Design a protein around this motif. Sequence first.
Motif, mmCIF file in Angstrom:
data_model
loop_
_atom_site.group_PDB
_atom_site.id
_atom_site.type_symbol
_atom_site.label_atom_id
_atom_site.label_comp_id
_atom_site.label_asym_id
_atom_site.label_seq_id
_atom_site.Cartn_x
_atom_site.Cartn_y
_atom_site.Cartn_z
ATOM 1 N N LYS A 356 0.842 -1.182 0.000
ATOM 2 C CA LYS A 356 0.000 0.000 0.000
ATOM 3 C C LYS A 356 0.880 1.235 0.000
ATOM 4 O O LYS A 356 2.086 1.166 0.231
ATOM 5 N N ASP A 357 0.260 2.373 -0.269
ATOM 6 C CA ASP A 357 0.930 3.656 -0.196
ATOM 7 C C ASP A 357 0.199 4.540 0.796
ATOM 8 O O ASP A 357 -1.010 4.406 0.995
ATOM 9 N N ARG A 358 0.936 5.446 1.418
ATOM 10 C CA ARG A 358 0.408 6.213 2.530
ATOM 11 C C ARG A 358 0.720 7.683 2.345
ATOM 12 O O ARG A 358 1.795 8.046 1.866
ATOM 13 N N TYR A 359 -0.227 8.522 2.731
ATOM 14 C CA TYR A 359 -0.070 9.956 2.610
ATOM 15 C C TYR A 359 -0.758 10.614 3.788
ATOM 16 O O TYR A 359 -1.797 10.139 4.248
ATOM 17 N N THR A 360 -0.179 11.700 4.272
ATOM 18 C CA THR A 360 -0.735 12.443 5.390
ATOM 19 C C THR A 360 -1.149 13.817 4.900
ATOM 20 O O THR A 360 -0.303 14.613 4.487
ATOM 21 N N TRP A 361 -2.443 14.090 4.946
ATOM 22 C CA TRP A 361 -2.987 15.347 4.463
ATOM 23 C C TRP A 361 -2.931 16.378 5.574
ATOM 24 O O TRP A 361 -3.383 16.117 6.690
HETATM 25 C C1 LIG Z 1 9.485 14.288 11.346
HETATM 26 C C2 LIG Z 1 10.717 14.228 10.495
HETATM 27 O O1 LIG Z 1 11.357 15.232 10.204
HETATM 28 N N1 LIG Z 1 11.076 13.012 10.071
HETATM 29 C C3 LIG Z 1 12.246 12.773 9.242
HETATM 30 C C4 LIG Z 1 11.832 12.306 7.840
HETATM 31 O O2 LIG Z 1 12.975 12.289 6.992
HETATM 32 C C5 LIG Z 1 11.187 10.925 7.871
HETATM 33 O O3 LIG Z 1 9.770 11.049 7.954
HETATM 34 C C6 LIG Z 1 9.188 10.075 7.059
HETATM 35 O O4 LIG Z 1 10.068 9.770 5.993
HETATM 36 C C7 LIG Z 1 9.656 8.634 5.211
HETATM 37 C C8 LIG Z 1 9.918 9.019 3.755
HETATM 38 O O5 LIG Z 1 11.147 9.717 3.629
HETATM 39 C C9 LIG Z 1 8.204 8.162 5.507
HETATM 40 O O6 LIG Z 1 7.781 7.278 4.491
HETATM 41 C C10 LIG Z 1 7.211 9.370 5.687
HETATM 42 O O7 LIG Z 1 6.685 9.719 4.400
HETATM 43 C C11 LIG Z 1 5.569 9.313 3.707
HETATM 44 C C12 LIG Z 1 4.649 8.504 4.712
HETATM 45 O O8 LIG Z 1 4.857 7.276 4.838
HETATM 46 O O9 LIG Z 1 3.789 9.238 5.275
HETATM 47 C C13 LIG Z 1 5.942 8.545 2.433
HETATM 48 C C14 LIG Z 1 6.432 9.446 1.306
HETATM 49 O O10 LIG Z 1 7.574 10.220 1.710
HETATM 50 C C15 LIG Z 1 5.344 10.444 0.908
HETATM 51 N N2 LIG Z 1 4.698 10.041 -0.343
HETATM 52 C C16 LIG Z 1 4.057 8.877 -0.630
HETATM 53 C C17 LIG Z 1 3.506 8.810 -2.051
HETATM 54 O O11 LIG Z 1 3.904 7.932 0.139
HETATM 55 C C18 LIG Z 1 4.279 10.634 2.020
HETATM 56 C C19 LIG Z 1 3.727 12.075 1.982
HETATM 57 O O12 LIG Z 1 4.710 12.938 1.422
HETATM 58 C C20 LIG Z 1 3.254 12.561 3.370
HETATM 59 O O13 LIG Z 1 1.931 12.104 3.633
HETATM 60 C C21 LIG Z 1 3.340 14.078 3.474
HETATM 61 O O14 LIG Z 1 2.907 14.487 4.771
HETATM 62 O O15 LIG Z 1 4.849 10.534 3.319
HETATM 63 C C22 LIG Z 1 7.895 10.564 6.388
HETATM 64 O O16 LIG Z 1 6.976 11.102 7.317
HETATM 65 C C23 LIG Z 1 11.734 10.107 9.036
HETATM 66 C C24 LIG Z 1 11.760 8.619 8.772
HETATM 67 O O17 LIG Z 1 10.599 7.981 9.286
HETATM 68 O O18 LIG Z 1 13.089 10.504 9.269
HETATM 69 C C25 LIG Z 1 13.200 11.767 9.906
HETATM 70 O O19 LIG Z 1 14.506 12.234 9.803
#
Ligand SMILES: CC(=O)N[C@@H]1[C@@H](O)[C@H](O[C@@H]2O[C@H](CO)[C@H](O)[C@H](O[C@]3(C(=O)O)C[C@H](O)[C@@H](NC(C)=O)[C@H]([C@H](O)[C@H](O)CO)O3)[C@H]2O)[C@@H](CO)O[C@H]1O
Lengths: 551, 551, 551
Positions: A356-361
């Motif tokens: 699955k894929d995940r996104y945070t709005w």
């Molecule tokens: C709080 C903080 O600064 N944390 C950092 C950061 O580098 C990182 O947070 C997470 O990083 C990975 C991706 O690099 C996670 O997958 C989270 O991102 C995701 C998610 O799973 O929510 C996946 C992906 O980057 C994005 N796109 C898709 C299509 O899935 C989505 C999306 O952009 C968000 O919904 C936007 O809000 O987010 C991300 O939160 C952590 C590692 O956990 O490391 C810290 O240094």
Amino acid sequence: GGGVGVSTGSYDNQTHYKFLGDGWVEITAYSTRMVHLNMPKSENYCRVRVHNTNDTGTASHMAMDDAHEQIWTPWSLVDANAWGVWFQPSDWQYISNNMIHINLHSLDQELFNVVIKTVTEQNTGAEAIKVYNNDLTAAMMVALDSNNILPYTPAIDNQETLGFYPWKPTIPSPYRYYFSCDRNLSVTYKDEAGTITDTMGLASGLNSQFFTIENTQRINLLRTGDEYATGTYYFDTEPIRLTHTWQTNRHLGQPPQITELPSSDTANATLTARGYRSGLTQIQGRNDVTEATRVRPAQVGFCQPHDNFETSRAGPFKVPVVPADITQGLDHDANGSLRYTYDKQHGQSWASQNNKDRYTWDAVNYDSGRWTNNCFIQSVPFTSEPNANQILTNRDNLAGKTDIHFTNAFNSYGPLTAFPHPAPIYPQGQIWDKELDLEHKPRLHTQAPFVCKNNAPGQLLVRLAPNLTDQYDPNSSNLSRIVTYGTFFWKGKLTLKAKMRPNATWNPVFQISATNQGTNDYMSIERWLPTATGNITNVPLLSRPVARNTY
Amino acid sequence: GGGVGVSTGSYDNQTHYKFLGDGWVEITAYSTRMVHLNMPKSENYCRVRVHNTNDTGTASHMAMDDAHEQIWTPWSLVDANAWGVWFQPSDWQYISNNMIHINLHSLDQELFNVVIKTVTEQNTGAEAIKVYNNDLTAAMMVALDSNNILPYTPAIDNQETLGFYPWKPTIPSPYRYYFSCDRNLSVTYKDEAGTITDTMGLASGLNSQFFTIENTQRINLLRTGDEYATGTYYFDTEPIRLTHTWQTNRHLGQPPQITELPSSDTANATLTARGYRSGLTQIQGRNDVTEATRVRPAQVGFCQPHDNFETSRAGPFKVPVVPADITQGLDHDANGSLRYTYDKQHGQSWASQNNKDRYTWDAVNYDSGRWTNNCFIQSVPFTSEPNANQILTNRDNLAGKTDIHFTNAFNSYGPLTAFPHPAPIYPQGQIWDKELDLEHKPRLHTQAPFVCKNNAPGQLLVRLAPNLTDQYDPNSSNLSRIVTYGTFFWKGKLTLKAKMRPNATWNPVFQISATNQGTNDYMSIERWLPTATGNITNVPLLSRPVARNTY
Amino acid sequence: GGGVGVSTGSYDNQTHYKFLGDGWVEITAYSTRMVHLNMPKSENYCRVRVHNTNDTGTASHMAMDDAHEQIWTPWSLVDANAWGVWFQPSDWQYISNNMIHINLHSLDQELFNVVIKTVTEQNTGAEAIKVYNNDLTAAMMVALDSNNILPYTPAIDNQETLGFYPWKPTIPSPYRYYFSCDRNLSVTYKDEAGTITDTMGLASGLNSQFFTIENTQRINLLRTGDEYATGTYYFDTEPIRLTHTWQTNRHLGQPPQITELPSSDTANATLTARGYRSGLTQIQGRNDVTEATRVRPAQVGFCQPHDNFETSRAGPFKVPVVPADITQGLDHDANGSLRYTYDKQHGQSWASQNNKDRYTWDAVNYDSGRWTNNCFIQSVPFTSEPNANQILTNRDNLAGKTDIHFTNAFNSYGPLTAFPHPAPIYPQGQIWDKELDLEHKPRLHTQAPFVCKNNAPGQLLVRLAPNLTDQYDPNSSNLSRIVTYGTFFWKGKLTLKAKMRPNATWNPVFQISATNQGTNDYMSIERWLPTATGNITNVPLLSRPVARNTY
Ligand SMILES: CC(=O)N[C@@H]1[C@@H](O)[C@H](O[C@@H]2O[C@H](CO)[C@H](O)[C@H](O[C@]3(C(=O)O)C[C@H](O)[C@@H](NC(C)=O)[C@H]([C@H](O)[C@H](O)CO)O3)[C@H]2O)[C@@H](CO)O[C@H]1O
Ligand SMILES: CC(=O)N[C@@H]1[C@@H](O)[C@H](O[C@@H]2O[C@H](CO)[C@H](O)[C@H](O[C@]3(C(=O)O)C[C@H](O)[C@@H](NC(C)=O)[C@H]([C@H](O)[C@H](O)CO)O3)[C@H]2O)[C@@H](CO)O[C@H]1O
Ligand SMILES: CC(=O)N[C@@H]1[C@@H](O)[C@H](O[C@@H]2O[C@H](CO)[C@H](O)[C@H](O[C@]3(C(=O)O)C[C@H](O)[C@@H](NC(C)=O)[C@H]([C@H](O)[C@H](O)CO)O3)[C@H]2O)[C@@H](CO)O[C@H]1O
């Protein structure tokens, strides 16, 4: 007329715009899908429970309890309610940039070109080839609930709605609904000594409702030449505003008057001394007027108890949270940002290897959010420069616990509260929702922009009529039947009213724009483009680009 | 027609009363002012910030942060919205005593007899005399915003509204509005070790709105013979009740039945023993009925979190508080009493040597207030005579802090809550206010009795058209121009609907009455009378004199 | 009626949008300016020449020759033709994003509230104060040329058009026109031995035209109560397209057919061997079809002789160049990008210390550009792998000179050529232009999008009528007259027809959007916002954001 070898409908997915007058736009969206339908894996209504002890049997795991009771039905539903169904990405851009508000109008639906085939396995052996051929006399059962007698079951909750890609076939969601059952689950923390109740109850003569499609509905039988058409449904709803609000509770009203204009661009202006400043405040005993302490018309946004789990008969659940801006302090849960999980059909990418894929709005309204670490409460009688005992900060341990702070349990909602209505989420989000039948109703539902005042649009249910072999015993436990599947086209028309926005501002407004590849900017264009192998992805578009004056 | 040497209007400040039928009164209030207008101190729109580090650079001073971002404009606004503008004190008495409720109807405005003069300094030297003479061809720029495109900016917030004295000239308020900017200010207590962030952010492409009068409006040029007239504006508002409510949550419903009438006037009546008393209560497990524990129809008034500071992107601010009675325990902030700061023009006295005068308004509704030290919460299962651990008092230290108590953070607002709408403040108070553009709206605004449902009355903006010398370089940074000022008359008509009160009571009702000088009673007459040198003061009159039965 | 002390007009700068039907928008733009006018520095028509020998007296400086002959007039012109006059930046955004094409319709103009003052110097001495007072009987002379008899003289060429800021006063451009004179300037290179002719000729009985405003026009005399109104002018013009074209000459037609779809996203597709490929080419003797050598419908864009200086009787001048995309190779002059020089009034910033500000506009059509270093010509009979003598590259020295290459002198324009019409430049650019009176006319003018087919809108000329002292000798060489200046308001209304764009594309289109400060992106918002001291800047906005399919 209709018959074998005659198409009963037409395929129209394109979108239209009529300009009806000054600023008014009638948006008509056609959408069509090929739908693949399997013979149901059982012919019987089934009352089943999932009770997972492995997760809940051990302490502190309360949050992952899935235990419930549901009615499984052979029927499947075609659910068109998501935004990603009706619009292609550019349409969403075009609407989101140019229009101040938008509202639902009407919905139509059609089913046509039913095709049903039977499967037989010839040449039994290592080859084991399958043969496909048409059953012309087979039929498909179709039922629509106009009166909303059945439990209302939005398919987007599980992301089971029709796919977002016009050229990819899609599947129905199997229809199911909750059934009343009582659960007792004790509350514990990690590595706590004791015993966890973790039980479920017997059926309730009071609360038990078992519904059957056949008894509640009129079912149409559709053979190949047949077609089905829903009448035109009309929404009664309030329009939603497409422009975000920047204006915080501290931006309301008239600013203080500066003494004189600054000398240079780097300089800061100065105000009349707070001792001498005129104004209105609710603080007693101090002669001051400060931008922070001055009275405002109303509270914009409010602090909310967050990660609040309350337990009724069914079990623990998290209390919903009105979506608000995550502030510069980024804390998501306090402001209740939405987090979606969805598959390739609705999103993600066929390039992705993950399930699955995940996104945070994040909320796009930058006014009403709350940044908790900077919230505080101050003792009375008020004083400047409070000591440690005179102020309650977010670093203060509540009930003698390290990670709990009053902002967890604090609820500021009140008569003076005002907040913006959250915004639709383009690729994945629920367009409309049915209103609860309770007497006293919530001000808004959390996920869905539109709420039907009187009667929601009906749910569309389908199944394949069973094909029986030569030998059928009504009393047999197991049912042998011909392997059968079918396909049909679903078509729908969704009409929307919207109005162009004015622009009075000197400066350029923010817009949704594509961006060159090679920079990691979220809008980089290739994410909207196909790949070499045909992989495509569809990602959430920011909404409400244009600012608005709240007050 | 109009022309030099012909008056374009008439001066009418008097008030009228028509009796239209049974109990119905149409109140028409004319008000007129001579307005003095100066050439603006700059010709340019300016985006300025006040960031005061001296106050906020050191810990615990958070409450005095003034930091914000505003747009400074050469335009000035004529704002007629306060009660003290429209009525003379006796009128307020007459209305407040005799009328049960009152409502806004219509508003008119006019500008006439524009006079513009130029200043020159003759006989340069120790004498340095100034010469005043008319510029007949000079003009004044006038703009009204009917569509409320500009940020809405009540002038009373800073007490910049037109003066309250018909015979004293008055000045406009310079027009300005907030501009989106982000602030980070950390939370600290007194003498706390650490560092305070105390920063402000760069401009936001999302949130930036810069409005210009010239682009958003139609400006009328007024020379001497010219006059300007606003059309008739009509309010859509709910009427407000002019009678206070005494009736507390413990006064609702039927009193208990006494056993027998007392023997003497000093004696007290007795009731059926609480063990045997019939009634209805929500307490479990006890057989009792007590006046305190008996069920009531609804909650009257509610406990509010007080001195609550919440922080969104803009910074910390105090949450507004619904005005309620300060009880016998006198605590103002818990019940959110208003405190005004105002100058000689709007109040105070020309006898006063202080820069401003201050007054604290107490709510006149004696029902809904909360006296906190006597509020408490009791443990469950309920018991008579709770021990120390079974009751939570206001002396109980919350989170291990001396001066914080649960009544600080406690919020009782709920579905059963009912409270009276607060009351207008005669000399200084905001008559009407524009409603926020958010979807979900507050039940009431705090300062203003009346809220315009659809579209607020427009804001009236003026400036002097620039007079240029012989030498003008468009590219020069500094602008030389003729020293110029002007005056004009502002006239307006405000129509109100009101209804006489009935009196069914045997006893005499309370009234607003003058009182002899020589006693310190608040109503002592000389405060409404001129002095020998012409000093006059105008002080808040108590409102809602007459009691009303709530239930 | 009008008279002293009565305004003769109203100030309206706001812009409107009507939606007349499907996709059609009528844009009405009001614009108004206060105009400052000085008594002309001479009362006489003057025939003057600038001949700068210092620059041209020495070799190779030919390009800087300014030598010409002009007629100086006491009259001044009010010229409204630039885009920056009529629109505020956001309007340009709104139009540029949403509309496929746009066209001029009508133009109105008005002059009103004339004010004329006289200057006298009192208290002669160190103080030397100036006194300003109205002359009520003085008049201003106003003339409009409807018949375009006078030489047509766009003021934007020198950037003398009315300022772009509604709230800042502006000045007219003094009216002047070229006069026939012959110049001989020899051509030389740096440090070349010889003599330079560098002469100018005597007046020509053939070519001499001397025009006088008074003889060619009807002049209206305007006193204070007077006002002047031009009739409604109507444009006859072709609409211009607001969407850029990406589609190069190698993108036309059908792509070759790939053999099979690639296996992975990183892989590249393959085509039928060029030996076996079907197609159409103009190359003789080779059996091949290549994407480069295949025939295309037409030539898109063309190579142009660049930095071409041709000399007629008047002198050397650079040949104009059709604006086209500067390619990845960035070379500006080959594709003739425009470069503007403008002042604070029209641009720049009051923060800037430089006398002028400069910007280089790049064409937004990414198809028709030419990248010269990659252009080449190949010998006949054609061959693969040409040797050094068989191909002419851009590294090849022409006429035995290092820095000259055939692309300098090469001209590919021909019957098969097709190119897009260049685009308007928002803050600074010429909206319309008059067509030359020659029989054979250019396909397009270079700077101006719109060209008036029949008769251009008239030129509006003003001067102050001379105020004479008591002593006037008609025969005296020097003229003593009263120091006098005046101001008046200019108002105009410009109507435009435009049509909304469709969007058929799946992906999001590019848009013009604001961007947060703190990144150096060209769209960073603060450039559109005022400063603390009121400094504001107005910079060129990119135009034609949305792509279009050419073929
Ligand atoms: C709080 C903080 O600064 N944390 C950092 C950061 O580098 C990182 O947070 C997470 O990083 C990975 C991706 O690099 C996670 O997958 C989270 O991102 C995701 C998610 O799973 O929510 C996946 C992906 O980057 C994005 N796109 C898709 C299509 O899935 C989505 C999306 O952009 C968000 O919904 C936007 O809000 O987010 C991300 O939160 C952590 C590692 O956990 O490391 C810290 O240094
Ligand atoms: C809580 C208590 O009992 N405090 C007493 C009391 O004597 C006093 O309280 C303050 O006393 C002075 C005036 O005597 C202050 O100025 C406060 O009064 C003012 C105010 O500033 O709010 C000024 C003035 O008395 C009043 N009138 C005007 C025109 O300004 C106003 C007005 O009456 C109030 O708004 C009514 O609520 O109040 C007053 O609170 C303190 C000294 O601080 O001493 C204690 O013994
Ligand atoms: C060809 C190359 O790579 N040259 C680089 C480059 O760093 C630089 O080119 C020039 O740099 C300065 C500014 O950094 C010049 O002023 C030129 O820019 C200007 C101009 O004068 O044309 C000024 C300014 O940067 C821009 N804005 C304004 C308001 O004036 C304008 C504008 O962006 C252009 O019109 C865009 O095309 O351009 C710039 O060409 C040279 C130094 O000359 O150094 C090389 O390393």
